[PDB]
Every structure is written in C-alpha cells, then in structure tokens.
Amino acid sequence: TIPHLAIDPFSLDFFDDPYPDQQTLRDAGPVVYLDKWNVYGVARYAEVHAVLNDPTTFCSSRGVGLSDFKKEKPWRPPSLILEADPPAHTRPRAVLSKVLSPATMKTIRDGFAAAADAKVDELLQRGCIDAIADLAEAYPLSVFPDAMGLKQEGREHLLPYAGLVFNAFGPPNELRQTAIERSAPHQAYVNEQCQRPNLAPGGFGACIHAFTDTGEITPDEAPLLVRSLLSAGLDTTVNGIGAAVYCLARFPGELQRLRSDPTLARNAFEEAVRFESPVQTFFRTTTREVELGGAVIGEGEKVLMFLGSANRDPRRWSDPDLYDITRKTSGHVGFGSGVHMCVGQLVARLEGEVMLSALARKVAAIDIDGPVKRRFNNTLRGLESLPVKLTPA
Numbered sequence: 001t002i003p004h005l006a007i008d009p010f011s012l013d014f015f016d017d018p019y020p021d022q023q024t025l026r027d028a029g030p031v032v033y034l035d036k037w038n039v040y041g042v043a044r045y046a047e048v049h050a051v052l053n054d055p056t057t058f059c060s061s062r063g064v065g066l067s068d069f070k071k072e073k074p075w076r077p078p079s080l081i082l083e084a085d086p087p088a089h090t091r092p093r094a095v096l097s098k099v100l101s102p103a104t105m106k107t108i109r110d111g112f113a114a115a116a117d118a119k120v121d122e123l124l125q126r127g128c129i130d131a132i133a134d135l136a137e138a139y140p141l142s143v144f145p146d147a148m149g150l151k152q153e154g155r156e157h158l159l160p161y162a163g164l165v166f167n168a169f170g171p172p173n174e175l176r177q178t179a180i181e182r183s184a185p186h187q188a189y190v191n192e193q194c195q196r197p198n199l200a201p202g203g204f205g206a207c208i209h210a211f212t213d214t215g216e217i218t219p220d221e222a223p224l225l226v227r228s229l230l231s232a233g234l235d236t237t238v239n240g241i242g243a244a245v246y247c248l249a250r251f252p253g254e255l256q257r258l259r260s261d262p263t264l265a266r267n268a269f270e271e272a273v274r275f276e277s278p279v280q281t282f283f284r285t286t287t288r289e290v291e292l293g294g295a296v297i298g299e300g301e302k303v304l305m306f307l308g309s310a311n312r313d314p315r316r317w318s319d320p321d322l323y324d325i326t327r328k329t330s331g332h333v334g335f336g337s338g339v340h341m342c343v344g345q346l347v348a349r350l351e352g353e354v355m356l357s358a359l360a361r362k363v364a365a366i367d368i369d370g371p372v373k374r375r376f377n378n379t380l381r382g383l384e385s386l387p388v389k390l391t392p393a
C-alpha cells in the first residue's frame with residue numbers, strides 16, 4: 001500500500017536540485033517509505049502540517065534527527081526544548097518565549113536596523129561583493145553574538161558549531177561523520193559560553209540565567225537553553241537572509257516592488273523563508289501505531305517531514321515556484337508549526353526585515369556577477385558564495 005522509493009534526500013545530488021525529487025515524493029502518495037534510510041516520509045503540505053500539530057503521537061523526545069534516542073546515544077546532551085515533549089517542554093519553552101519576546105524586540109530593533117543600514121551602505125562602496133560572506137554571514141555575525149552577550153574570544157567556533165548541529169540531524173552519511181569527528185573544540189567553546197559568568201548582563205544568555213530565580217527553569221537547565229540559542233539562532237538567519245537576497249537577485253520585478261514599498265520588507269522575507277525553506281527537514285518518532293495517509297505506521301518509527309516540499313506543494317500554494325512578496329504566506333511551515341514552532345521567529349524576522357528594508361531603500365539592482373556555489377548540509381539549504389553587483393538607488 002505504501003510506495004517504496006530509493007531517493008536519498010540527504011545525497012549531494014538531491015541537495016544540488018531537490019525540486020524534481022520533492023515532486024516525486026509528493027506525487028507518489030501522502031506517505032512514502034524511504035528504503036535508503038528505513039524511514040517514512042511525508043512531503044505534501046497537509047500531512048506535514050498535520051504531523052507537526054500531533055505531538056502526542058509524532059514526538060520530539062526521541063530525537064528530531066534520524067537517530068532514535070531510545071536506540072542510540074545522542075551526540076550531545078538532549079536539548080531541553082527541541083528534543084522534549086510537553087509537559088517537560090513547556091516551561092523551558094516559556095523561558096525562551098519571554099527572553100525572545102515582543103517586548104524584547106523593542107530593546108534591539110534600533111541597533112539591528114542601524115547595523116543593516118550601515119552594512120548595505122558599506123557594500124555599496126564596494127559594488128561587487130559576495131552576498132554570503134559579506135552580507136548573509138557578516139550581518140548576523142555583527143548583531144547576534146552581541147545580542148546574546150557573548151565575549152569576543154572564540155566566536156570563530158559559532159558557525160562551525162551550528163553547521164555541526166544541523167548536519168547531526170541527518171543520517172550517518174559522510175557529511176554527518178565529518179561534522180561530528182573532531183568536533184570537540186567547537187563543543188567545548190559553546191558549552192563554556194553557556195555558563196553564567198561568560199554572558200554579558202542584559203544579553204539573551206544572561207536573561208535566560210535570570211529566569212532561574214522564577215522557578216521556570218533550574219540553574220542547571222539554563223546553560224542548555226543558552227546552548228539552544230547558539231545552535232539555532234545564527235546559521236538559520238544566515239541562510240534565511242541569503243535566501244532572500246538570492247530571491248531578489250533572481251526576481252528583479254520583485255526587488256522593484258520592494259523598492260517601491262519598503263513596508264513589504266517583512267513579507268518579502270517571510271516569502272523567502274517559504275520559497276527556499278532554509279531548514280529543509282525534521283524528523284519525528286511515533287509513540288504508537290498510527291494511520292497516516294492510509295498507511296499504518298508502527299510504534300517507534302522515524303517519520304521525515306519535508307518542510308521545503310510542503311512549502312512548494314501545488315495542492316496548497318498557487319504558483320508555488322514563484323517568489324511573490326505580496327503572497328499570503330501565513331501557514332507556511334518554514335518555521336515549523338505547533339508547539340515547537342520556531343521560538344526565535346521574532347528575532348529571525350527582525351533581522352530579515354531590517355536587512356530587506358535597507359536594500360529596499362538603498363539599492364536599485366542586484367546582479368549575479370560571478371560563480372554561484374551551493375553549501376551542502378543535511379538539514380540546511382543555502383549557498384556558499386553568491387557574487388553580486390549592487391547598484392545604488
């Protein structure tokens with residue numbers, strides 16, 4: 001009843017161009033079995049959304065990578081938020097919600113916007129830049145470590161550690177083995193910065209530790225929640241901003257609409273998150289036998305959710321393969337959905353908005369003008385190098 005496919009969604013050829021295989025995965029049926037890795041897969045919007053919103057059957061506490069924590073040791077101590085189910089999830093989630101709250105965004109908006117404006121003006125003095133190293137990476141590196149309250153020393157471990165985290169959700173392929181092998185120096189840096197004396201007062205890390213007084217988290221939970229922000233909150237925004245710039249470079253008509261109304265910046269970023277889905281995939285593990293798409297999935301089975309595919313499913317989206325900055329984007333699953341829906345989404349959108357606002361006001365054209373190179377990661381989709389010429393407004 002369930003179709004068996006040989007597609008390896010963690011292969012380099014799949015990462016290089018996933019869209020034909022994602023359609024095969026959708027059109028084969030609402031649920032497929034991937035023989036390469038012995039997992040179920042769901043790639044249509046409706047089933048992806050339903051699984052994300054059914055946490056009592058499709059759980060996260062057995063790992064949201066391929067590895068099942070009931071069968072294997074996690075490569076690092078489990079996350080108290082990503083790799084937890086309610087009720088254990090709830091109070092750590094509330095702490096991160098409060099630390100990254102609407103109210104908190106007021107405290108960082110002026111500096112985040114000023115740094116985006118300054119970066120775009122700086123790049124306009126050069127003309128021809130690499131939108132990854134010089135923009136998608138440079139801008140988050142200039143604001144987010146500081147907003148965390150990190151010291152200066154050791155920051156060169158932040159992107160390597162995040163790449164490791166995201167590669168480690170994948171299957172035990174070469175990308176995962178290479179990431180985990182000799183990763184101890186990256187882990188040691190991050191783990192040390194999670195300790196309270198290393199985090200500047202007022203920054204996100206120190207604010208997490210300040211919640212240990214309230215009873216929401218104990219002091220020994222706070223370093224792992226700082227660890228969550230250092231895992232999830234940098235590389236994602238690099239690939240999100242890079243996706244938006246790549247979208248604007250390829251769709252000049254949409255750059256021109258953005259220039260004409262910079263208040264479209266927030267939805268232009270949201271649409272880039274849908275269109276490229278920088279976080280491509282996550283797993284769940286079934287806690288019980290469960291019918292999904294007419295297939296009976298046993299207990300203890302891994303289920304791979306294709307977020308990027310759900311975000312391009314023609315059953316749900318009109319012209320899914322077009323970048324449309326006035327699209328009604330609500331419902332896309334690029335930040336997830338349900339109890340684990342990205343708790344950093346306001347920070348991600350703040351960064352993306354203010355960068356796209358600066359481009360909208362200051363740039364007239366974005367032209368690719370050198371070799372484009374893709375970056376490969378078991379979970380993240382994005383580019384290694386994106387040479388563009390920026391023309392001033």
Ligand code: HEM
Pocket residue numbers: 060064081082083093096100228229232233234236237239240241273277278279282333334335336337339340341342343344345347348
């Ligand atoms: C464009 C940028 C981002 C994207 C595309 C993204 C994507 C996602 C997704 C898909 C999930 C759901 C995981 C799941 O259901 O298993 C999630 C969760 C999470 N994200 Fe983000 N994220 C981004 C930015 C950020 C930022 C800036 C932060 C922190 C500053 C952050 C911190 C987290 C955390 C801690 C979780 C776990 C929430 C929970 O399990 O309740 N993310 N993210």
Ligand SMILES: O=C(O)c1ccc(CO)cc1
Pocket residue numbers: 079080081082083165227228229231232279
């Ligand atoms: O809690 C974490 O360490 C963590 C890591 C990765 C994600 C990816 O969205 C979310 C949370």
Ligand SMILES: [Cl-]
Pocket residue numbers: 076187188190191227
């Ligand atoms: Cl670690």
Ligand SMILES: [Mg+2]
Pocket residue numbers: 075076
């Ligand atoms: Mg260890």
Ligand SMILES: [Mg+2]
Pocket residue numbers: 197
């Ligand atoms: Mg010290």
